[PDB]
Amino acid sequence: KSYTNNKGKEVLVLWGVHHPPSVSEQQSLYQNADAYVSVGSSKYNRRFAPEIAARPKVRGQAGRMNYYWTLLDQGDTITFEATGNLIAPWYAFALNKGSDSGIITSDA
């Protein structure tokens, strides 16, 4: 699935890649023991493969998930192409400018 922008502003796109802990779980969730996802644009290009391994539980889950983000430009497109693990984006953000901001940790 692809997408082009036309907003005239940069678009901030997020996605994720799941990978289960057991081969039976991979078989159960996606029917395909081999898998990959692949993301392409003009200046971004990566192919991801899942990995299946045993690891201790956190929040009662043994799987893991990785999160990624990319700034598009005006004009240029983006293409997702996947066969086993895509956590597809469902909303995104169009960004303005105006500098000199930040993050504050305070309790006032």
Add this chain to the structure above:
Amino acid sequence: SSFEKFEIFPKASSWPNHETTKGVTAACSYSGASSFYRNLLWITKKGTSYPKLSKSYTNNKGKEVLVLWGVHHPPSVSEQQSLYQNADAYVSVGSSKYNRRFAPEIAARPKVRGQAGRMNYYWTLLDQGDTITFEATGNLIAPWYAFALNKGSDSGIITSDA
């Protein structure tokens, strides 16, 4: 400031299926003979059979633990076949905040210290509580000692000849 060296996986009991000894090379030669590192442990096979291994560890020392390991990869496919019986291999290390799968690579490259293979070394700080799991099918250089670390800042390294 200071640490305490202890033994995570003892050589006698923790590896009952594989071959603990015969993991020795001539590039680490001590007193004329051949030897190997004193904190790591090469692992080979006990009778041309390499079962899949998985071993875990939790800490309880209340301090952070500094764990080292290594991944060997030979230069030739025959050497991979000879040392581990499995043309395909991987190791995998997991914890709460560390997660990586490694694959060996086999290629030709010039000799250094009369060896054509290579070996990569890795390290991780555990926390108090949290566990760690090694899981391997072809190339693990398992840890054999580790370190429990104290605090007390403002130290460093000096190169001097005084």
